[PDB]
Design a protein around this ligand. Structure first.
Ligand SMILES: CCCCCCCCCCCC[C@@H](C)C(=O)SCCNC(=O)CCNC(=O)[C@H](O)C(C)(C)COP(=O)(O)OP(=O)(O)OC[C@H]1O[C@@H](n2cnc3c(N)ncnc32)[C@H](O)[C@@H]1OP(=O)(O)O
Ligand SMILES: CCCCCCCCCCCC[C@@H](C)C(=O)SCCNC(=O)CCNC(=O)[C@H](O)C(C)(C)COP(=O)(O)OP(=O)(O)OC[C@H]1O[C@@H](n2cnc3c(N)ncnc32)[C@H](O)[C@@H]1OP(=O)(O)O
Lengths: 354, 354
């Protein structure tokens, strides 16, 4: 259905960014075959075919190399050296398929003093300034779940890597190795802060910048029911619209960008938002340019009309899953196929004519 | 010198995800031409040629269509309808270039009850459950900068769309429109949590899950010097290594996953970490699998040897900026070319033959 219809992807079963990257390829129509160790309830494994092989046996390695020989992309998220030892390194795969985009998904990268060291998202964004920038200033840093290292600065960059190399392959006729490190990707994800730091527009003080919570017009507020709204009214005209819905006289308030009076401004805004329930503000702004929105819990998302009308989610059995993003006007993506039964690796090899 | 060498991109000057998406294309070797209104210190504007046009004028519109006519990709991030009213909408562009990938970068999407409504990253993640999940449980949610909406679920999905549509064009010989809504992209970015919620592995309770700060083995700790380490020792063997390095006896501790005793477990780890300075812990956990890393501020990143050795950053006039990601073994990217003076739109047309 989607734009990636026809792309053949071999995924070497891992955790975090690799399976997320392979999911998105599958979402957009790619033919994704996942090799695991010898039906899943993990919705992330939608849009797959699962085969199983012992990659350490002679037989297991033979079939995998036959399946790789007929594929465009290979995704692996093991420590550097692992596929090399298995006999599935890029130098080995090239001998059977020099068009393969060999996509290596790691946190620390392929080389360097930390390249062989265990880690998780929180570690990768700890070394590059990111984690230090997240949270309130009166407290130790909070992890932004694993959104920044694993996915935003991880699978997403593997994805751009894969498709960019597929583009390069059109003219070269050949593939290459993509080295996607969470530490690199997340750095480029946050290039805006690096840019701002050079010009005095961002500081290393946590919780005291325009976009981290420090600004009263870009932060959440608790309402009378103990739920929250999000205020994002950066531009003066949107800020104006926000004060107008709150019924605050701007002449009575400190200026929007007088940072010396920010705690005063926040105390006034906090008093206003505390005077009514979330769904009141919910309704007072619902339609304006005030950049004020309800802070919905996951369990409330499916009831939001904008979410509903655009089909951002679909029901799997037992809960909502996000539909494929982004959206394409001519070759639209299908509703994802749920995880299905592990199939015979020989069936795939015949299908792919390997 | 990257993989996207040869790719022609027109960027309509904007803010946030569009410009970040444009930068990454230029990073990977694309020929990006940014049309602005009638020399920048914004590092995000690297790898561009900048031209000027009044798109409200007859001459300016005409010039843009000549430029778009010779491009592969067009990036625009205005409210839906804005390009249509300028005479640069998808249907207008189709008439001069039906190979064009028309990439539309919004928060709320091209259609829907909120599609005409102003907003910013914090709004888009407020409506889909993401923001509610970020922060400590005792206090209101904290924005994870604009990493999640603008970039990870914003420009990154625009990029995936652009590149996937280009693969698609290989067989169809045609472009199409890419509708990248931040509200969609970020939901796919947090799909692991939608997976986990369905299987009893994630709760809507802020700050009480595996990866949100709720686990003592996945969080930051404050050290003797008032600086922090990140701990991410999820796996038992990594956890065991962590305890060893702290000098703690596992038989004297609650089990790693006895959530009932998590506050007990956290208190003991807190005491341990606070007994030495942050850099003591890096020394202690230098090469180990304890998943313990120093929480560095942006200003300190350039001193970290793993950062240094892998050339994750380059020095640009001003300060450090992230080098391109991900990395490619055969067609590697160049160090980004700095922002330069605005050039004559007509010289670009001569170059591109438009
Ligand atoms: C919940 C998600 C957690 C979230 C917060 C995250 O951040 S997840 C991201 C974690 N980090 C990464 O993915 C970075 C790159 N990966 C790594 O550093 C490591 O793979 C991990 C994740 C630290 C795990 O380390 P580990 O458990 O020692 O495993 P590795 O060192 O990768 O080696 C894997 C061993 O398994 C074997 N293997 C794999 N597939 C097969 C197969 N089909 N048949 C037979 N054997 C297989 C490999 O041979 C390898 O063994 P060996 O070569 O080490 O002896
Ligand atoms: C320092 C802070 C102050 C700077 C501004 C704030 C941004 C800085 C903060 C950092 C990033 C912010 C972060 C949190 C974000 O979320 S960024 C993403 C924000 N959202 C989006 O981009 C979603 C799609 N965009 C939009 O909804 C809206 O463009 C915005 C962003 C809400 C802004 O609203 P707006 O200013 O009314 O813009 P639009 O409604 O698109 O109207 C644009 C008008 O300008 C005109 N225009 C543009 N270029 C030209 C040109 N070269 N020549 C002649 N005219 C030009 C267009 O024709 C259009 O006019 P019209 O259609 O109104 O008649």
């Amino acid at each position: 259905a989607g734009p990636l219809s026809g792309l053949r992807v071999v995924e070497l079963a891992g955790i975090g960014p690799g399976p997320h990257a392979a999911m998105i390829l599958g979402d957009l129509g790619a033919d994704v075959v996942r090799i695991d160790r010898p039906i899943s309830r993990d919705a992330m494994l939608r849009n797959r075919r699962i085969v199983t092989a012992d990659l350490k046996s002679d037989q297991g390695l033979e079939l995998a190399l036959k399946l790789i020989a007929k594929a465009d992309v290979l995704i692996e998220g093991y420590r550097p050296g692992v596929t090399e030892r298995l006999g599935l390194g890029p130098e080995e795969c090239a001998k059977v398929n020099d068009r393969l985009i060999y996509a290596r998904m790691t946190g620390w990268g392929q080389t360097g003093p930390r390249s062989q060291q265990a880690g998780h998202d929180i570690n990768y964004i700890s070394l590059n300034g990111i984690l230090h920038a997240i949270g309130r200033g009166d407290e130790r840093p909070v992890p932004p779940l694993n959104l920044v290292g694993d996915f935003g600065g991880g699978s997403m960059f593997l994805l751009v890597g894969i498709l960019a190399a597929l583009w390069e392959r059109q003219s070269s006729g050949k593939g290459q190795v993509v080295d996607a490190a969470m530490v690199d990707g997340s750095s480029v994800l946050i290039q805006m802060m690096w840019a701002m730091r050079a010009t005095g527009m961002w500081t290393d003080t946590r919780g005291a910048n325009m976009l981290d919570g420090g600004a009263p017009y870009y932060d959440t507020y608790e309402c009378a029911d103990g739920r929250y709204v999000a205020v994002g009214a950066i531009e003066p005209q949107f800020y104006a619209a926000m004060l107008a819905g709150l019924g605050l006289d701007a002449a009575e308030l400190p200026p929007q960008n007088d940072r010396a009076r920010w705690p005063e401004l926040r105390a006034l805004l906090t008093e206003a938002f505390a005077s009514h329930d979330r769904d009141h503000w919910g309704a007072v702004f619902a339609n304006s340019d005030a950049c004020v929105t309800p802070v919905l819990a996951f369990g409330e998302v499916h009831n939001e009309p904008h979410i509903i009308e655009r089909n951002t989610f679909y029901e799997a059995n037992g809960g909502w899953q996000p539909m494929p993003a982004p959206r394409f006007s001519r070759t639209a993506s299908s509703q994802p196929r749920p995880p299905a039964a592990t199939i015979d690796i020989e069936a795939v090899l015949t299908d792919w004519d390997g």
